[PDB]
Design a protein around this ligand. Structure first.
Ligand SMILES: CCCCCCCCCCCCCCCCCC(=O)OC[C@H](COP(=O)([O-])OCC(O)COP(=O)([O-])OC[C@@H](COC(=O)CCCCCCCCCCCCCCCCC)OC(=O)CCCCCCCCCCCCCCCCC)OC(=O)CCCCCCCCCCCCCCCCC
Ligand code: BCL
Ligand code: BCL
Ligand code: BCL
Ligand code: BCL
Ligand code: BCL
Ligand SMILES: CC[C@H]1c2cc3[nH]c4c(c3C)C(=O)[C@H](C(=O)OC)c4c3nc(cc4[nH]c(cc(n2)[C@@H]1C)c(C(C)=O)c4C)[C@@H](C)[C@@H]3CCC(=O)OC/C=C(\C)CCC[C@H](C)CCC[C@H](C)CCCC(C)C
Ligand SMILES: CCCCCC/C=C\CCCCCCCCCC(=O)O[C@H](COC(=O)CCCCCCCCCCCCCCC)COP(=O)(O)OC[C@@H](O)CO
Ligand SMILES: COC(C)(C)C/C=C/C(C)=C/C=C/C(C)=C/C=C/C(C)=C/C=C\C=C(C)\C=C\C=C(C)\C=C\C=C(C)\C=C\CC(C)(C)OC
Ligand SMILES: CCCCCCCCCCCCO[C@@H]1O[C@H](CO)[C@@H](O[C@H]2O[C@H](CO)[C@@H](O)[C@H](O)[C@H]2O)[C@H](O)[C@H]1O
Ligand SMILES: [Ca+2]
Ligand SMILES: [Fe+3]
Ligand SMILES: [Mg+2]
Lengths: 49, 318, 42, 40, 277, 43, 259, 44, 43, 44, 38, 39, 42, 43, 43, 41
């Protein structure tokens, strides 16, 4: 799309920057929590190595 | 002491206010308004008029049918003895269907009457919700009350309909009685391993406690600044007076932060609403995704451990 | 005049309302005939 | 509304490139994670 | 930092104790004499709780899990005397600090009320919550005869205390004052939702409408339930409901064990044994 | 008769009567469903 | 589907975490609503920065919402820019957080408990557009309940017990029928002044109105009304604030401390 | 019979009717599902 | 269809739709994780 | 029939309809997932 | 709120409603092939 | 409050974004089907 | 150190000091009462 | 260091310092009283 | 780096920094006392 | 606009990166030391 840049005309770019960073941090924290909760992907309590 | 503004010392009488005119085509308000001196001592003297429209009429008719069925079955439970009805009234109840009936309709005295009372009461509550929605709409007002009522209805439906259907058993539902529904409340907690360890029960209590805390805070605050007209909160919202300022400044000095005259009512609205929202969620999670709340708490490291000063040999381990 | 509709307007609404109601009853009847063939209840 | 047209184009340039840099690091991390412990 | 309208209210004086010694603000907070006393009452009590969590019930069970931290009262065998610090004495010290902090908070609120020239309803209302806490940790333990009757200081452990105290009377729902207090708690929550809704729906009406009036407010609940208590009286009612809930809750627990030792349903036998039936 | 609409509002009377009839119709159907001898949704 | 998300994760644990995220957003929303009044803050941080650092805290301020007033009284923005107002007081010490001492006669300073904002110079209106707070002599349909004494004629007594005046009329709220002000004929001057009901303690037996806020002499300086039969929102604040200043300023011992 | 619409507003009568039919439809569907001989989600 | 945006605001629709889609994606992923036949985080 | 939307606001009616349709779709999907005969995620 | 807007809304509403119904029918036809419920 | 011309541009991009988002979804569902079919 | 009274008002300080001293004396007596080896009422 | 009193005002700072020191002093004594090896009141 | 004091108020920074450090020092000491391997008051 | 001059943005960004990489470098060394101490993968 040659006009994807128009997303920044309707919503303030500063709010997106903080919102995207806050959302990604939460999403990253949540996925790490989910993996730690699994016996298969817990890198702290697996004994390897 | 100084006037605490708890009781109206000198009451004022005016012609009864008919109410803000309703949109054209609406039914008139019924009841000739009267003035109660004792009601006017603590609040407003005027009693009535009331709007009883089409929706309210259906809610009343459905509601009476449910209430009549419950009271009739209570009377039948004491074998029609009206004297024994009065003696045992708190203990009497319309009791839900037996466990072996699942979700099917059982005979009248084996849960059939309970289902009818449950359905008719639910219909009347739902119709009453439409009435609260319509009354706000007829006055050009927003629907905050109907949302808050819907949240309470969500909890009510979770107790008697949604959870029993999810468990596939009307026997999970609440009896229609004073002590019987207290017995249900205790038995629910006992059956599912100490509801104290249900985190949404914890949240519901925090919001129920917070509702009392906030209304005590806000009620005392408004009375403390009512000498400046703080009771007239619409004025203080549109035109911030010294009452709103002193109210906010008191709380800022007390606890480092404050609300506004309008936003305190948003805190109040959400605190009360979240009480039944989390109550409904906690009920819906119990018995469906969690069997023993205490054991769920142990699994998630919520339950404290105590030193073993007393213990029992398990007779099943023989 | 408790609603504020003339004779033509109440008649006009009744003309379409009956048509919409009749069609709804038509689909309902078909649904019940199909339901009866699947599993009669009487 | 607020931001003009030219700075809207320019914002996309750093937004697209920085997001692409984040995406590339994500792909590398997921490639490493798959070699460490594949999940499918 | 103050609110944009606050500077004209930051007046000297109105203290109960201290005069000009502590008459100042720290950030948004007013301090005064009872701000100093209350803060270091709370600070000491909080630090002792952390210390109580550091040693735990014992070294094996010690935990920093916020749900599981518990500072327990003494054993009942210690009676109304002082227990060793690791055997409930820390709980007794924290309780004293908590009382010091809570009362100082109430008295600091009184000084703020004097500064602002408002009614003393808020500190008076807060005294009810303090009174309920005092009933739980002082009045009831003294009536029973041991400090060990107080509830432990732990987010979940004090729920185990509430649970077991309730089942000391086999069915706590039948406690009459308990029933009255819950009715007030439930009614207060209903009244709060109604009051929050009415104010919000009037000041934030449907789109394209102006702010409504007090006439709309009275009409709305007259249209629904046939009665409107009024803009002033709803705050009287909300304060009354919340304070009555706590008063009757304090009554319900102080009669549970000091003034009633049987199961609570058995208390209703006075009504069941009326000679009318 | 014909004067029953002179002291009774047609609107309030009709919604009330239809409300009772609908509630009564529901109640009878519920009672019949509760009765094993008249449950038509059984085998 | 099932209750177990992973070996450890379960549905209830997910539900409670989902609530914490919603609740965090709700608290952020509520705090932003709280900050529609009195923000940005009056701070030394802004003062030394020359206004280059607005003190808002977290969360920041919300976009201004619109209150359209009835009867074309106007439109107000809840978050609004407010011009700084000078204070008729001076700091009692030069450190931050120090209180201010009012200048001149504290009862007349308009500072501390006697301070008030300047509200609109228009009367609060009933739903029909009439002034809401009016004397009984213009609200002719209003009356005192039979079981309660008529305030009119009662002797108004200041905090010291000395007679301050007599109650000429009663001002009532025409929307919610109730007393809001007592018109007092001041014994010294004779000029009528208003006395809010919140500062009036009725003695039904003695037919006396006791005002603990201010002395009898302080009644002469109560702010007066422009029009005799109505009161603006601005005047209402001025009158109530003046009596409140007496709770701290009227007597020297009222400043404290007790001991 | 067409004059019933002069004593009941079509908009208010229509929304009440749409909700009433939806509730009635839900009620009947639930009764059938709750009846073991007519539950179509049992698969038999 | 292009003329939909006359009533629906483009900006608020996007955040509402993206937020809706995100929680929908979480819900579907979590439902599959709750299914032993589709949980990809086990052995 | 072309006389339906002169009273119902297009925006409000779609908003109410879209929320209702999602809830009905969510409810039906969850009922089927709850019925072993129509659970497509159970393994068979 | 006028005729040239209300009539315009109904037209697109119809072909959007029919598109939803058409997808819904195909979904139900496929659902019947997968697992007939009657 | 949004005029017709900017409405024409928005719908084109939104449809393109929806088509682009749909395409990723279709591939993921194809890959999921190959990994473990559900029907 | 006489200048501390130009920072802290003496008449106000004495009341604060009395409360501090009494509260400290209360605490020490209680701590001693909690210790069996130094409980003088046993 | 003497500029700090141009940053921190003596009246408020001294009140905070003395209370924090007293609470710290109380805490350490309480920690020692809780430690059997250093409880000087153990006898 | 002396320009950090042109963006951050040194008074509020020092209050925040001194408070954080005091809490951190208490926290680390408390953690060590909670571990029997490092409780220095055990004997 | 944040009230900052356009030259302040250049100057802040440079110092921000220097402090960020210096912080990141200490972190990387810490993780290398932590990996040598007790590897987790
Ligand atoms: C489900 C329910 C339960 C959920 C979990 C609940 C858990 C318990 C909750 C407990 C909450 C405790 C915190 C309350 C506020 C603390 C006091 C405070 O400072 O407030 C300022 C703080 C921010 O103030 P602001 O107006 O943004 O400040 C403007 C500028 O920052 C002003 O700029 P500035 O330059 O002044 O900025 C500095 C400011 C910055 O403030 C902060 O950062 C503190 C906030 C951190 C959190 O500093 C302060 O405010 C404190 C100054 C202290 C000075 C003395 C320092 C002594 C230490 C030195 C020792 C050295 C040895 O306000 C709040 O945080 C409000 C919190 C509200 C929480 C309510 C939600 C929980 C209850 C839910 C139930 C209700 C129903 C819901 C429906
Ligand atoms: C479970 C198996 C592995 C593991 C598998 C993965 C996989 C797969 C991924 C990660 C990713 C991350 N892991 Mg890992 N990770 C593990 C254990 C850890 C541990 C730990 C103590 O155990 C920590 C602290 C981390 C931390 C991290 C983060 C560095 C990163 C996600 C941050 C984020 O949400 O950015 C979002 C927030 C932002 C602000 C991003 C900003 C984007 C900018 C514009 C791009 C340039 C960055 C710029 C310099 C700003 C600095 C921000 C940096 C992200 C620090 N992982 C275990 C050992 N981890 C993700 C990643 O690589 O993301 C980078 C990722 O895909
Ligand atoms: C033995 C059990 C039998 C059974 C035996 C009977 C018997 C006997 C009767 C019914 C009647 C009814 N049954 Mg059956 N019925 C059974 C199973 C069902 C099932 C089901 C899913 O199993 C359903 C949905 C119904 C539904 C119905 C309704 C159509 C009707 C009750 C309407 C009413 O209460 O009006 C009350 C509510 C109102 C609002 C009334 C007002 C109506 C409107 C507003 C006025 C319009 C006027 C119009 C011009 C005149 C025609 C009137 C029409 C009813 C519209 N039955 C089983 C199989 N059923 C009753 C009936 O036939 O009534 C018509 C009746 O006597
Ligand atoms: C169960 C089997 C598979 C699996 C099967 C599937 C299937 C099937 C699907 C996904 C989908 C997703 N999966 Mg998967 N997925 C699995 C496990 C994971 C794990 C994990 C840690 O285990 C993670 C983090 C994910 C993550 C994801 C997301 C990337 C994605 C859902 C995003 C969303 O909700 O949109 C909601 C939020 C938005 C829509 C916001 C908008 C974001 C985008 C960028 C909008 C841009 C529009 C357009 C592209 C703009 C550019 C246009 C051009 C310029 C012209 N999956 C397992 C292993 N997964 C879905 C997907 O592919 O969506 C992309 C999907 O259909
Ligand atoms: C477990 C092994 C050892 C032990 C190992 C360590 C280690 C390792 C450290 C300490 C440190 C400290 N230990 Mg030790 N410590 C032990 C037992 C104790 C006991 C006890 C009763 O058992 C006590 C009371 C202490 C107390 C202390 C503090 C003096 C100090 C932390 C100060 C701080 O946090 O400042 C933070 C609080 C502030 C800064 C707020 C104060 C504000 C004031 C007004 C301004 C002061 C700033 C000033 C201008 C500059 C500061 C430095 C000056 C040159 C003095 N330790 C045990 C026995 N301890 C730390 C230290 O030495 O720090 C210097 C440290 O690194
Ligand atoms: C496996 C467990 C290992 C361990 C492995 C690691 C690993 C891996 C890391 C640490 C890191 C840290 N560890 Mg370690 N650590 C252990 C045990 C400890 C113990 C203890 C009592 O046992 C303590 C007190 C610490 C403490 C610390 C901190 C010093 C540091 C985190 C700082 C931070 O969060 O900054 C965040 C907050 C700020 C940066 C705000 C402060 C602002 C400052 C003043 C900016 C100044 C600008 C300046 C000029 C440029 C930047 C330079 C740096 C700030 C120094 N560790 C054990 C032995 N630790 C991390 C680290 O090294 O970070 C630097 C890190 O990656
Ligand atoms: C009486 C009616 C309701 C009410 C009213 C009320 N509460 C009030 C007020 C009022 C009018 C205030 O003015 C005052 C306030 O300022 O609120 C913002 C307050 C207040 N009510 C609070 C809490 C609170 N109120 C509760 C209840 C109620 N408050 C009633 C339902 C509850 C419940 C039910 O649990 C709680 C938790 C505070 C937010 C605040 C008082 C703050 C205060 O006193 O601060 C000083 C003390 C500290 C900062 C910390 C002290 C720490 C101690 C030294 C150690 C810990 C001791 C404690 C026993 C630990 C127990 C922990 C376990 C139980 C988990
Ligand atoms: C109900 C009792 C009050 C009442 O009956 O007032 C009715 C008002 O209408 C009505 O239904 C009003 C119906 C609702 C009235 C009851 C509302 C609660 C009672 C007031 C509670 C005040 C305190 C509330 C808690 C603080 C009047 O109805 P009528 O019979 O036409 O007039 C009889 C009178 O004129 C006396 O001759
Ligand atoms: C004036 O009245 C007279 C005198 C004539 C009779 C009065 C009698 C009296 C005094 C009755 C008193 C009754 C009392 C005191 C009742 C107390 C009730 C209490 C405390 C109830 C508490 C909780 C009950 C709950 C939460 C029940 C909820 C039940 C629900 C939500 C059930 C819904 C059921 C449905 C929707 C049924 C669905 C099945 C369908 C298909 C209908 O079934 C066929
Ligand atoms: C606690 C909350 C705040 C309330 C303030 C008052 C706290 C308690 C008041 C101090 C009373 C101390 O009184 C002292 O108590 C201890 C502990 O029981 C008693 O000790 C006595 O009983 C304890 C246990 O019951 C025995 O271990 C001991 O052998 C015996 O001497 C002392 O004989 C008594 O002198
Ligand atoms: Ca590992
Ligand atoms: Fe209010
Ligand atoms: Mg029972």
């Amino acid at each position: 799309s040659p006009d994807l840049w128009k997303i920044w005309l309707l919503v303030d770019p500063r709010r997106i920057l903080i919102a995207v960073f806050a959302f990604l941090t939460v999403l990253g924290l949540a996925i790490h929590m989910i993996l730690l909760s699994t016996a298969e992907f817990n890198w702290l309590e697996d004994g390897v190595p | 002491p100084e006037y605490q503004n708890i009781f109206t010392t000198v009451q004022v009488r005016a012609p009864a206010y008919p109410g803000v005119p309703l949109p054209k085509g609406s039914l008139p308000r019924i009841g000739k308004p009267i003035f109660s001196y004792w009601a006017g001592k603590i609040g407003d003297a005027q009693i009535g008029p009331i709007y009883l429209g089409f929706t309210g009429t259906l809610s009343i008719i459905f509601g009476f049918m449910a209430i009549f069925i419950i009271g009739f079955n209570m009377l039948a439970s004491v074998d029609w003895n009206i004297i024994q009805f009065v003696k045992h009234f708190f203990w009497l109840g319309l009791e839900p269907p037996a466990p072996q009936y699942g979700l099917t309709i059982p005979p009248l005295s084996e849960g059939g009457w309970w289902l009818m009372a449950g359905f008719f009461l639910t219909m009347s509550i739902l119709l009453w919700w439409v009435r609260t929605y319509k009354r706000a709409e007829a006055l050009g007002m927003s629907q905050h009350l109907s949302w808050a009522f819907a949240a309470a209805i969500f909890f009510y439906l979770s107790l008697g309909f949604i959870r029993p259907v999810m468990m596939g058993s009307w026997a999970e539902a609440v009896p229609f009685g004073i002590f019987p529904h207290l017995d249900w409340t205790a038995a629910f907690s006992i059956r599912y391993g100490n509801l104290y360890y249900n985190p949404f029960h914890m949240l519901s209590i925090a919001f129920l406690y917070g509702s009392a805390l906030l209304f005590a805070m806000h009620g005392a605050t408004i009375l403390a600044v009512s000498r400046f007209g703080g009771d007239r909160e619409i004025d203080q919202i549109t035109d911030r007076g010294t009452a709103a300022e002193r109210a906010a400044i008191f709380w800022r000095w007390t606890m480092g932060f404050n609300a506004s005259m309008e936003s305190i009512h948003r805190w109040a609205w959400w605190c009360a609403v979240l009480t039944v929202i989390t109550a409904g969620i906690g009920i819906l999670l119990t018995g469906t995704v969690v069997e023993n709340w205490y054991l769920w708490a142990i699994k998630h490291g919520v339950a404290p451990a105590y030193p073993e000063v007393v213990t029992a040999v398990d007779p099943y381990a023989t | 005049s408790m609603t504020g509709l003339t004779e033509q307007e109440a008649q006009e609404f009744h003309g379409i309302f009956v048509q919409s109601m009749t069609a709804f009853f038509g689909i309902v009847v078909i649904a019940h005939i199909l339901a009866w063939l699947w599993r009669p209840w009487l | 509304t607020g931001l003009t047209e030219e700075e809207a184009k320019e914002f996309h340039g750093i937004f697209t490139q920085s997001m692409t840099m984040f995406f590339g690091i994500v792909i590398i991390a997921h490639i490493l994670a798959w070699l460490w412990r594949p999940w499918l | 930092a103050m609110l944009s309208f606050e500077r004209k209210y930051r007046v000297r004086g109105g203290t109960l104790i201290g005069g000009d010694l502590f008459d100042f603000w720290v950030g948004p907070f007013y301090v005064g004499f009872f701000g100093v006393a209350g803060f270091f009452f709370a600070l000491l009590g909080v630090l002792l709780i952390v210390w109580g969590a550091t040693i735990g019930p014992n070294a094996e069970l010690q935990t920093y899990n916020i749900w599981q931290i518990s500072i327990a009262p003494p054993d009942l065998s210690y009676g109304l005397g002082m227990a060793p610090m690791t055997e409930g004495g820390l709980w007794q010290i924290i309780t004293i600090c908590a009382i010091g902090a809570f009362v100082s908070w109430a008295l600091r609120e009184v000084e703020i009320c004097r500064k602002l020239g408002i009614g003393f309803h808020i500190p008076f209302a807060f005294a009810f919550a303090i009174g309920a806490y005092l009933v739980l940790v002082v009045v009831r333990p003294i009536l029973m005869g041991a400090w060990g009757h107080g509830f432990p200081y732990g987010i979940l452990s004090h729920l185990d205390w509430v649970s077991n105290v309730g089942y000391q009377f086999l069915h706590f729902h039948y406690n009459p004052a308990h029933m009255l207090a819950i009715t007030f708690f439930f009614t207060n929550c209903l009244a709060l939702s109604m009051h929050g809704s009415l104010i919000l729906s009037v000041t934030n009406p449907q789109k394209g409408e102006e702010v409504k009036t007090s006439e709309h407010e009275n009409t709305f609940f007259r249209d629904i339930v046939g009665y409107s208590i009024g803009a002033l009286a709803i705050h009287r009612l909300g304060l009354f409901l919340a304070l009555s809930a706590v008063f009757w809750s304090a009554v319900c627990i102080v009669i549970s064990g000091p003034f009633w030792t049987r199961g609570w349903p058995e208390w209703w036998n006075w009504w069941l044994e009326l000679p009318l039936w | 008769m014909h004067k029953i609409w002179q002291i009774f509002d047609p609107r309030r009377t009709l919604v009330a009567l239809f409300g009772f009839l609908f509630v009564l119709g529901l109640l009878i159907h519920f009672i019949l469903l509760s009765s094993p001898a008249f449950n038509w949704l059984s085998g | 589907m099932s209750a177990a998300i992973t070996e450890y994760m379960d549905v209830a644990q997910l539900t409670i975490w989902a609530f914490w995220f919603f609740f965090a957003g709700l608290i952020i929303y509520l705090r932003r609503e709280d900050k529609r009044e009195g923000y940005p803050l009056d701070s030394d941080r802004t003062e030394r920065s020359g206004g280059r650092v607005k003190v808002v805290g977290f969360p920041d301020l919300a976009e201004p919402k619109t209150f359209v007033l009835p009867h074309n009284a106007g439109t107000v923005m809840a978050p609004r820019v407010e011009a700084p107002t000078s204070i008729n007081a001076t700091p009692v010490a030069p450190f931050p957080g120090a209180p201010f001492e009012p200048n001149g006669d504290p009862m007349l300073s308009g500072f501390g408990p006697s301070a008030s904002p300047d509200r609109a110079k228009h009367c609060d209106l009933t739903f029909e557009g009439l002034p809401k707070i009016v004397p009984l002599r213009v609200a002719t349909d209003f009356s005192i309940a039979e079981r309660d004494p008529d305030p009119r004629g009662m002797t108004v007594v200041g905090l010291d017990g000395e007679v301050a005046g007599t109650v000429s009329d009663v001002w009532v709220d025409r929307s919610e029928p109730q007393i809001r002000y007592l018109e007092v004929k001041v014994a010294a001057g004779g000029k009528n002044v208003l006395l809010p009901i919140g500062f009036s303690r009725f003695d039904k037996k003695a037919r006396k109105v006791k005002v603990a806020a201010i002395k009898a002499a302080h009644f002469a300086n109560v702010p007066t009304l422009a029009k005799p039969d109505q009161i603006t929102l601005y005047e209402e604040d001025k009158v109530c604030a003046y009596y409140a200043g007496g709770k701290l300023y009227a007597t020297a011992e009222r400043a404290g401390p007790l001991l």
